[PDB]
Ligand binder design. Structure first.
Ligand SMILES: NC1=NC(=O)C2=N[C@H]3C(S)=C(SO)[C@@H](COP(=O)(O)OP(=O)(O)OC[C@H]4O[C@@H](n5cnc6c(=O)[nH]c(N)nc65)[C@H](O)[C@@H]4O)O[C@H]3NC2=N1
Ligand SMILES: NC1=NC(=O)C2=N[C@H]3C(S)=C(S)[C@@H](COP(=O)(O)OP(=O)(O)OC[C@H]4O[C@@H](n5cnc6c(=O)[nH]c(N)nc65)[C@H](O)[C@@H]4O)O[C@H]3NC2=N1
Ligand SMILES: [Mo+4]
Length: 773
C-alpha cells in the first residue's frame, strides 16, 4: 500500500494530497494560492462519504417492466445491484432502441452540469461523443448563470460580455475612486473556477481596501463583501434594481449632469429612451421618488448615489442574481445604459464589468497558449457549444412535444424526447419547480445517470452507474479561466473505489456495443490522450515564443506557469473609446444600443426595445402579492451548488439537520419563531423544511435559503410531498425570463414561513439507499 504525497487540482483550487496506506488523509492548499477555499476538506471527504456510489444499479420496476414500468415510484430507492456487464448491455440496448424507434430527436443529451475540471475526463463532452456515434441527440443552449444577460448583451454591446476579460485588477487599484458591487458578492463566489481557479480576485480586493477606495454594495444581504470593506450598504427589495437605476438616470437628466458627448458619439437610441424616462409615454416620470415607492430605498439616497457616480471614477461591478429572474434581460441592459450616461466606459478604472465575481475575471492574462481537450466529434466557453433548446425549457419540452417556442427572434418546435442521459449534473436540485418536474419526468421511458454521489438525480434514475472522482484518475487542465496562469497535471491520488469506473471507460464500453469502439477511443489510452493535448499546447507555445518542457519533464514537475507581458494593463473598451470608427462594436450601428431596432422588430411584449420597468410574476410588496417574504435563493457559501452537501462540511451549517434559513429578527418574532427552530417554508408550488438562524444580516422581508440542498421527499408518490431537507427549487417557478432569452427565473420567489409543529421527520438523503450498501 502506497505512502506519499501527490499534487492535483479541482474546481476549488490546486492542492497536495497526503496518502497513507493507499488512502487520502488530507488535502493541503498549494503554497502559491493567495486565498484557499475552506471547502477543500469536504472535497477529500466526498471520495469516501456514506453517499459514495459503490455499484451499478437498476431500478427494480425498470428491470422487471422496461417501458411499462410504473414511473411514479422513481426516487423511492428500490434498486437492484447488477454486474457491470449487465448494466452496460442494458444501457447500450436502450440507447439503440430509442435511436431506431424515435430518431435523434428522442434522446436528450444536454446534460447540463458543473462536473469536474479536466480536458480528458470531461463527462458531458464524452456523453455527446458517444451519442453522436449512436445517431444524434437533442442538446441544450445557454446556461443557468447568465441565461438572460448572455442573449441581450450581443444586441447592446455586440458580444456576450459576461464571459470576457475585465479591466485588470491593478488598473482598478491605481485609478478607481468608487467601486460598486451591484448584486455581487465576490468574496463568496470567487472561491471556485470552471477550470482550476487561481483565486485572483482576493489580492485585487485587498489592494482596493489598502488604497482606501470608497466601496458601495447594493444587495439585500449584508455579505462578507460588505464586511471586508466596511462598505456603504444599500438594501433594495429584491427585483427592484431596474427601478433604482431609472431613478438614478432621471436624476442625472433632471439636474443636467449626464455626459451628453459620450451619449452623442458612442451610443444609439437615447432620444427614444428619454421620453419613457421623463414619463411622456405613460404619464409616469421615473423619478427617484417613484423608485423609492417600488424599491424601498430612500429617494435622497438614490439621488446622492447618482451624483457621486458622475463626479468620481466609478466601476460598476455587477453580479448575475438580478438577471436570474423574470424580465432578467432588463437588469444589465439598464446598467449599461446608466454606465453610458456616466461617460466613463473605456477609461482606466471606469465603466462596468460583469465578471469580477466569477472565476478570477480581472486577473491579468498571461501570454501562454490555450489548452484543448477531447471533443464530441468536431472555441469559446465549452458549455455554449429542433436539435437545440434553451437549457431551462427542459420541462416545458417534456410537457409540450411539438409545440412552438420563441427565442431571440426565431420560432422553433420542441422535440419529442423519450430518454434522457445525465452525467456531471444534478437537475433534481438545479432545475426550478420541483413538483412540476417530478410529474413531467414520467414522460420519459428511460433515465440514465452517472455520478459518484447519491444525489437526488441519481436517486431518480432507472439506471445508475458509479463514476470515479478526478482523484482516482489522471488528467490535465488550465489554471485560470481568464488568467491562463499555467497548466496542471491532475495526477491520480488513489485507486478507483468499489466498482466505480471513469465516465470515459463507461462510454467506451457502450460505444463498443454499438459497433463503434475505435471511433470513440481513437486507439488512444488515458496517458496517450493527455500527452496529445499537452503536445498541441507546446507546439502552439513554441510558435508564440513561450518555452515549454517536453511532456515527461512537465509531468515530473506537475505544473508549467506562463509569463505576464502586457496583461496587467488591459482596459476594457479602451480601443472603442479611443477611436469608435476604426474600432466599432459588433452591433448593427457599431455603437452601444440603448434602443434596439432589431429587438423592436421581434414584437415581444415581455422584452421591449429599450430598458423598461415591468411588473414581475411575483415580488416583495408587489400589488396583490400573495406571500410576504422574498427568498434570496442564491449561491451557497460552503458548497459548489449541490456538491459537497453529503460530506462532513454539512455539520458546520445544518440547523437540526436541515439546510439553514436566515431570517430577520422582526420577521421571526412576528411568527413566534426562535433561533434554531425547524420551520416549514411554503407557497402555492411546494413546501420544504429548513432550520432557522436569526440575524439582521438579511433585510426585513427577505429570507436567505441557498440553492443546492439535496431534495429529500417524504413520499415520492404523494403529489406536493414535503421536502425534509431544504431544496429551495421546490418553491421556485419554472418560467422564461422573456421570449428573447428564455432564461431561468430561479430567484423570482415569494413564500410564507411558519414554525414546524408536524410529526417528527427522519432525514434519508445523506445515507445510501438500503440496497446500495
Ligand atoms: N433557485 C436557483 N438559484 C440559483 O441561483 C441557481 N443557480 C443555477 C446555476 S448558475 C447553476 S450553474 O451556471 C446550476 C448548477 O447546477 P449543477 O447540476 O452544475 O450542480 P452541481 O451540484 O455542480 O452538479 C454537478 C454534479 O456532477 C457530479 N460530478 C462531478 N464530477 C463528475 C464526474 O467526473 N463524472 C460524473 N458522472 N459526475 C460528476 C457531482 O457529483 C454533482 O452531483 O444551478 C442552477 N440552479 C439555481 N437555482
Ligand atoms: N462558493 C460558491 N458556490 C457556488 O455555488 C458558486 N457558483 C458559481 C456559479 S455557476 C455562478 S453562475 C456564480 C453566481 O454568481 P451570482 O452574482 O449569480 O451569485 P448569487 O450568490 O446568485 O447572487 C449574488 C448576490 O446577489 C444578491 N442579490 C439577490 N437578489 C438580488 C437583487 O434582487 N438585487 C440585488 N441588488 N442583489 C441581489 C444576493 O444576496 C447575493 O449576495 O457563482 C459562482 N461561484 C460560486 N461560489
Ligand atoms: Mo452558473
Amino acid at each position: 500500500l502506497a505512502n506519499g504525497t501527490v499534487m492535483s487540482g479541482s474546481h476549488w483550487g490546486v492542492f497536495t494530497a497526503t496518502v497513507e496506506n493507499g488512502r487520502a488523509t488530507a488535502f493541503t492548499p498549494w503554497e502559491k494560492d493567495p486565498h484557499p477555499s475552506p471547502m477543500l476538506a469536504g472535497v477529500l471527504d466526498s471520495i469516501y462519504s456514506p453517499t459514495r456510489i459503490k455499484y451499478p444499479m437498476v431500478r427494480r420496476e425498470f428491470l422487471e417492466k422496461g417501458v411499462n414500468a410504473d414511473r411514479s415510484t422513481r426516487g423511492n430507492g428500490d434498486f437492484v445491484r447488477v454486474s457491470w456487464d449487465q448494466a452496460l448491455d442494458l444501457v447500450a440496448a436502450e440507447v439503440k432502441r430509442v435511436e431506431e424507434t424515435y430518431g435523434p430527436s428522442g434522446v436528450f443529451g444536454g446534460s447540463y452540469g458543473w462536473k469536474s475540471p479536466g480536458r480528458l475526463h470531461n463527462c458531458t463532452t464524452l456523453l455527446r461523443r458517444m451519442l453522436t456515434l449512436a445517431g444524434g441527440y437533442v442538446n441544450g443552449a445557454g446556461d443557468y448563470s447568465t441565461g438572460a444577460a448572455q442573449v441581450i448583451m450581443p444586441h447592446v454591446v455586440g458580444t456576450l460580455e459576461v464571459y470576457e476579460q475585465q479591466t485588470a485588477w491593478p488598473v482598478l487599484a491605481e485609478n478607481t475612486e468608487v467601486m460598486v458591487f451591484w448584486a455581487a458578492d465576490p468574496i463568496k463566489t470567487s472561491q471556485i473556477g470552471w477550470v482550476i481557479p487561481e483565486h485572483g480576485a482576493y489580492p485585487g480586493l485587498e489592494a482596493l481596501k489598502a488604497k482606501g477606495t470608497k466601496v458601495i454594495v447594493i444587495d439585500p444581504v449584508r455579505t462578507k463583501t460588505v464586511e471586508f470593506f466596511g462598505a456603504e450598504h444599500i438594501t433594495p427589495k429584491p427585483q427592484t434594481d431596474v427601478a433604482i437605476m431609472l431613478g438614478m438616470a432621471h436624476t442625472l437628466v433632471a439636474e443636467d449632469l449626464y455626459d451628453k458627448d459620450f451619449i452623442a458619439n458612442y451610443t444609439s437610441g437615447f432620444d427614444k429612451f428619454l421620453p419613457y424616462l421623463d414619463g411622456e409615454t405613460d404619464s409616469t416620470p421615473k423619478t427617484a421618488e417613484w423608485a423609492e415607492g417600488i424599491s424601498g430605498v430612500p429617494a435622497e439616497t438614490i439621488k446622492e448615489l447618482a451624483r457621486l457616480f458622475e463626479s468620481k471614477r466609478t466601476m460598476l461591478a455587477a453580479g448575475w442574481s438580478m438577471q436570474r429572474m423574470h424580465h432578467g434581460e432588463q437588469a444589465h441592459w439598464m446598467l449599461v445604459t446608466l454606465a453610458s450616461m456616466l461617460g466613463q466606459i473605456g477609461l482606466p478604472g471606469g465603466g462596468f464589468g460583469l465578471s469580477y465575481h466569477y472565476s478570477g475575471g480581472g486577473t491579468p492574462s498571461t501570454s501562454g497558449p490555450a489548452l484543448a481537450g477531447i471533443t464530441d466529434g468536431g472555441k469559446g466557453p465549452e458549455w455554449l457549444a429542433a436539435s437545440v433548446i434553451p437549457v431551462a425549457r427542459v420541462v416545458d419540452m417534456l410537457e409540450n412535444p411539438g409545440a412552438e417556442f420563441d427565442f431571440n427572434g426565431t420560432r422553433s418546435k420542441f422535440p419529442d424526447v423519450k430518454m434522457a442521459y445525465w452525467v456531471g449534473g444534478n437537475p433534481f436540485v438545479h432545475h426550478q419547480d420541483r413538483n412540476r418536474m417530478v410529474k413531467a419526468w414520467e414522460k420519459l421511458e428511460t433515465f440514465v445517470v452517472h455520478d459518484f454521489q447519491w444525489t437526488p438525480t441519481a436517486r431518480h434514475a432507472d439506471i445508475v452507474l458509479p463514476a470515479t472522482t478526478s482523484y482516482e484518475r489522471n488528467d490535465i487542465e488550465t489554471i485560470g479561466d481568464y488568467s491562463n496562469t499555467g497548466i496542471l497535471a491532475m495526477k491520480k491520488i488513489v485507486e478507483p473505489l468499489y466498482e466505480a469506473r471513469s465516465d470515459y471507460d463507461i462510454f467506451a464500453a457502450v460505444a463498443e456495443r454499438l459497433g463503434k469502439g475505435a471511433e470513440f477511443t481513437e486507439g488512444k489510452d488515458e496517458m496517450g490522450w493527455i500527452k496529445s493535448f499537452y503536445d498541441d499546447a507546446a507546439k502552439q507555445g513554441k510558435a508564440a515564443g513561450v518555452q515549454m518542457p517536453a511532456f515527461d519533464a512537465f509531468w515530473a514537475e506537475g505544473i508549467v506557469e506562463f509569463p505576464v507581458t502586457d496583461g496587467a494593463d488591459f482596459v476594457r473598451y479602451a480601443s472603442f473609446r479611443e477611436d469608435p470608427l476604426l474600432n466599432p462594436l459588433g452591433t448593427p450601428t457599431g455603437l452601444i444600443e440603448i434602443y434596439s431596432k432589431n429587438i423592436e422588430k421581434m414584437g415581444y411584449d415581455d422584452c421591449p426595445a429599450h430598458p423598461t420597468w415591468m411588473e414581475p410574476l411575483e415580488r416583495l410588496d408587489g400589488p396583490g402579492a400573495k406571500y410576504p417574504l422574498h427568498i434570496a435563493a442564491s449561491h451557497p457559501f460552503n458548497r459548489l451548488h449541490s456538491q459537497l452537501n453529503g460530506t462532513v462540511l454539512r455539520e458546520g451549517y445544518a440547523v437540526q439537520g436541515h439546510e439553514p434559513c436566515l431570517m430577520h429578527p422582526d420577521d421571526a418574532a412576528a411568527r413566534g419563531i426562535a433561533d434554531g427552530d425547524v420551520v416549514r417554508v411554503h407557497n402555492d408550488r411546494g413546501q420544504i423544511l429548513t432550520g432557522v438562524k436569526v440575524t439582521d444580516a438579511v433585510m426585513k422581508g427577505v429570507i436567505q435559503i441557498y440553492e443546492g440542498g439535496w431534495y429529500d421527499p417524504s413520499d415520492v408518490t404523494e403529489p406536493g410531498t414535503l421536502d425534509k431537507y431544504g431544496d429551495v427549487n421546490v418553491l421556485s417557478a419554472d418560467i422564461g425570463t422573456s421570449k428573447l432569452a428564455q432564461g431561468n427565473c430561479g430567484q423570482t420567489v415569494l413564500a410564507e414561513v411558519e414554525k414546524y409543529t408536524g410529526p417528527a421527520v427522519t432525514l434519508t438523503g445523506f445515507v445510501a439507499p438500503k440496497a446500495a450498501e
